[PDB]
Structures are given as structure tokens and as C-alpha cells.
């Protein structure tokens, strides 16, 4: 046969240890580029002028960071949303000073991760599965787009994208609270309900199935040996689990249908995290959390503070201190 | 950077002692008659 046919058969082969596929043709080079640049930058990159004020911030291990403080630092505010590939710089020295690696990493990562999602659709199709695992993955993926692309677009600069590091993430969160009161935004609150609820139901489902494993083992060996990979019989008694759960709450509170149960397990965290991503992506255009500052007033007109006003005092402390040398005029308008 | 000198030995033992414990158990499992 001709070579295009053999190569195409290898690309779409369901026998490769790791599935390649057509989305994989894009995913593999972009994720490798992003991964290699990230590792080299995290170890060895020099300080980066994130806020465009000639005040370079050190992110890499060799320039004085540890695992917790290190980061790949976002590109310079002087660049804004301009496209800054390596060949736009006069030299690698300029590229590194201005935060070039950050743009290289996040653009390759976002492309590679979108292809990761298509690859999940692709293999499920090739295996004769139903298609929607990729829809579940769209929730974390949407969240990564929010903090690396959408929020920079709304604010006009990749210097406000989330840094690629542990302490840099916290910096992003604290500045975000100062500028958007994200805690008071219902989409973030839905996000919390999504991940608090996802963790709760994770523990719940795990505990209920484990509680009802059918006895297949002796007292010494692990009970996991009681399940053989690929056996036709279900390994636990769901009627027993729900006879417990229905008495724990009340009879009708239980998901007796395993398919409804497992659909709910998928839907609750995925929907909550969709709203979390949409929170970031809409605060990106400065539609912010609820503002009840001075909402309660006494009969004379004195302000009676609420807990919202205390939140505001903390937000003020964040606002006035962040990027302490970057603002020349009284309003932080992006 | 002026790091704590005991940080190195602390990290090294933290990795090695439990890793070796697991390696001992794994290898003697593999060598049992099959």
C-alpha cells in the first residue's frame, strides 16, 4: 500500500499503547513544546518585567526561588495583548526579560489541551463508546482558558494572566478579590458548591459502594482481590447501599438507579465548574461580585456596617498595596 | 540563598526511608513462589 494509507492507519490505530489520532497530531507537539519550555524556564529563566515598569520579578529556581515561590512569570504589561513570539525579539536576552516564555507556554498549552479534549471524543468514537467524557473535561479546560486567555483579553494584557507557579496563583487570586470581589459573585459561589459538592459526593459514593462489597475474601487478604478485572457481575450490592442511605436521610432521597446516580456524579461538579469558569470569564469584562458597601443606613444616615463592609476593608488593603509602583493616577481601571 | 543546612538531610531521609520500605515489600512479593 501507499505510505499515506499506512501512516494514517498508524495514526488512528486503536492498538497503540497511547492513542495518537488526528487531534493527537496537534496535541503531541504543542504539549511537548509547552512542557519543555516550562521546565527550562522554571529552573533557569532570569527575572521578568511582568508589570512593564522595569521591575523584574524572579521566578526560577536558579535565581533564588523554591518550589512554592517559583513561577514562569507573565509577559510584560508594555506588551499588553500584542503577540510576542521569539522572532519578534531582538535577542533571547530581550525575550526573556519581557516574559516571552510565558506566552509560548500558555498558547501551546491551550492548543494542546483543546486537542486533548477532541482526542477524548475521537478515541471514544473509535472504541464504540458514547461521546460525552470530553464534555466533562470541558469544565477544567474552560477554567484554564478563563485564567490564561479570557481574563487577559478583558483586561488588555497577558501580564494579568494567571502566573505559572504556586505563589503566583495566590497573587492572582488575591488581586482578583481586590478588583472584582469574586467571593461575593454567585458564579464563584456556584463553583465552590461544585467542588465542595463534588468532594462530598466523591466520598459518599466511595463509602457507600465500599460499605456494600459482597464477601469474596478472607479476613487476612485485601478485599480488592474480591473483584476480578472484567467480571460480568457487579461487585457490590446497591440495594443494600441504598437501604442504608434511605434510612440515613429518608426513603426517597436515594438514587436507586445507578445510571441516574452516576449521571449526577458527573453533572454536579461539571456544572459548578462551568459556572466558576464563567465567573472568571465575565469578571474579565468587569461585571463584578455583589457590592453591599454601606447598604445599611440608620434613621439619621449613619452607615451601619455589615460583614460585607469588613470584606471591603480587606479588599482595600489588597488594592492599595498591589503593584505598588505601577499606578500614577487615582483609579485602577484595568 | 541562606537555607537551613538540615533541609538537605531531612528531605533525603524523607524520600529514602519510606521509598526503601516500599521497595523491600515489593521485591520480596515478586520473589514469592508463583
Amino acid at each position: 500500500a501507499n505510505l499515506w494509507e499506512r501512516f494514517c492507519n498508524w495514526v488512528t490505530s486503536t492498538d497503540n499503547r497511547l492513542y495518537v489520532g488526528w487531534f493527537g497530531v496537534i496535541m503531541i507537539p504543542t504539549l511537548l513544546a509547552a512542557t519543555i519550555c516550562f521546565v527550562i524556564a522554571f529552573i533557569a529563566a532570569p527575572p521578568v518585567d511582568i508589570d512593564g515598569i522595569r521591575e523584574p520579578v524572579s521566578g526560577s529556581l536558579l535565581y533564588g526561588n523554591n518550589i512554592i515561590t517559583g513561577a514562569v512569570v507573565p509577559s510584560s504589561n508594555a506588551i499588553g495583548l500584542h503577540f510576542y513570539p521569539i522572532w519578534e525579539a531582538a535577542s533571547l536576552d530581550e525575550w526573556l526579560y519581557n516574559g516571552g516564555p510565558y506566552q509560548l507556554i500558555i498558547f501551546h498549552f491551550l492548543l494542546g489541551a483543546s486537542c486533548y479534549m477532541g482526542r477524548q471524543w475521537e478515541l471514544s468514537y473509535r472504541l464504540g463508546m458514547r461521546p460525552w467524557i470530553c464534555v466533562a473535561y470541558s469544565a477544567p479546560l474552560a477554567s484554564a482558558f478563563a485564567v490564561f486567555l479570557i481574563y487577559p483579553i478583558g483586561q488588555g494584557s497577558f501580564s494579568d494572566g494567571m502566573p505559572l507557579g504556586i505563589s503566583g496563583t495566590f497573587n492572582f487570586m488575591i488581586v482578583f478579590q481586590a478588583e472584582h470581589n469574586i467571593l461575593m459573585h454567585p458564579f464563584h459561589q456556584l463553583g465552590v458548591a461544585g467542588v465542595f459538592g463534588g468532594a462530598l459526593f466523591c466520598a459518599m459514593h466511595g463509602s457507600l459502594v465500599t460499605s456494600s462489597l459482597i464477601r469474596e475474601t478472607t479476613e487476612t487478604e485485601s478485599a480488592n482481590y474480591g473483584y476480578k478485572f472484567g467480571q460480568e457481575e457487579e461487585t457490590y450490592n446497591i440495594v443494600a447501599a441504598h437501604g442504608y442511605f434511605g434510612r440515613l436521610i429518608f426513603q426517597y432521597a436515594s438514587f436507586n438507579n445507578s445510571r441516574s446516580l452516576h449521571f449526577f456524579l458527573a453533572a454536579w461538579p461539571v456544572v459548578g465548574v462551568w459556572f466558576a469558569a464563567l465567573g472568571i470569564s465575565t469578571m474579565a469584562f468587569n461585571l463584578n461580585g455583589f457590592n453591599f458597601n454601606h447598604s445599611v443606613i440608620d434613621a439619621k444616615g449613619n452607615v451601619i456596617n455589615t460583614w460585607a463592609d469588613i470584606i471591603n476593608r480587606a479588599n482595600l488593603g489588597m488594592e492599595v498595596m498591589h503593584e505598588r509602583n505601577a499606578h500614577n493616577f487615582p483609579l485602577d481601571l484595568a | 540563598m541562606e537555607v537551613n543546612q538540615l533541609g538537605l538531610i531531612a528531605t533525603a531521609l524523607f524520600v529514602l526511608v519510606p521509598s526503601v520500605f516500599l521497595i523491600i515489600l515489593y521485591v520480596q512479593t515478586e520473589s514469592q513462589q508463583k
Binding site: 529552573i43 529556581l61 518550589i67 478485572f229 467480571q231 | 540563598m1 533541609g7
Partner: peptide, 30 residues
């Protein structure tokens, strides 16, 4: 020495990924 420690642990983790994927105990139906 701290940079070497961080990079060493990271490198051990990537190696573990390689063995966990390609030298896994193979799933067998019964």
C-alpha cells in the same frame, strides 16, 4: 544544593510516570 534537590525529586517523579505507564502490571480479564 536546594535547586539540585528540587530538580532531582521532580526528575524521579517523571521517571515514575514512565515506569507506571509503560511497565505497569498489565490488566488481565478473568
Amino acid at each position: 544544593m536546594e535547586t539540585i534537590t528540587y530538580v532531582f525529586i521532580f526528575a524521579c517523579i517523571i521517571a515514575l510516570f514512565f515506569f507506571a505507564i509503560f511497565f505497569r502490571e498489565p490488566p488481565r480479564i478473568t
